[PDB]
């Protein structure tokens, strides 16, 4: 169970190129299930029902009171 369950914010909008990638939009919230190689991270949408791959250089890990 390699999952961290860390939320993240969408800094910029991104579109998937494969049939296994997830879409992203500036201001959109996502949950990074776990980091993956190739510079791709598996995250899910807000609905929590849609999961896929998202860019790491396009999102920003959110924290409760840390930086």
């Amino acid at each position: 169970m390699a999952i961290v369950n860390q939320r993240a914010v969408a800094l910029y909008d991104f579109e998937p190129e494969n049939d296994n990638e997830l879409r992203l939009a500036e201001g959109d919230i996502v949950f990074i299930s776990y980091k993956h190689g190739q510079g791709w991270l598996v995250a899910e949408n807000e609905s929590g029902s849609k999961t896929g791959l998202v860019p790491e250089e396009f999102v920003s890990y959110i924290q409760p009171e840390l930086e």
Binding site: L11, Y12, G39, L53, P55, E57, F58
Partner: peptide
């Protein structure tokens, strides 16, 4: 695993 990306991730803009 289910997902399997095979390509270089994009890059952010310069403005922001």
């Amino acid at each position: 695993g289910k997902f399997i990306p095979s390509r270089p991730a994009p890059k952010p803009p310069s403005s922001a």
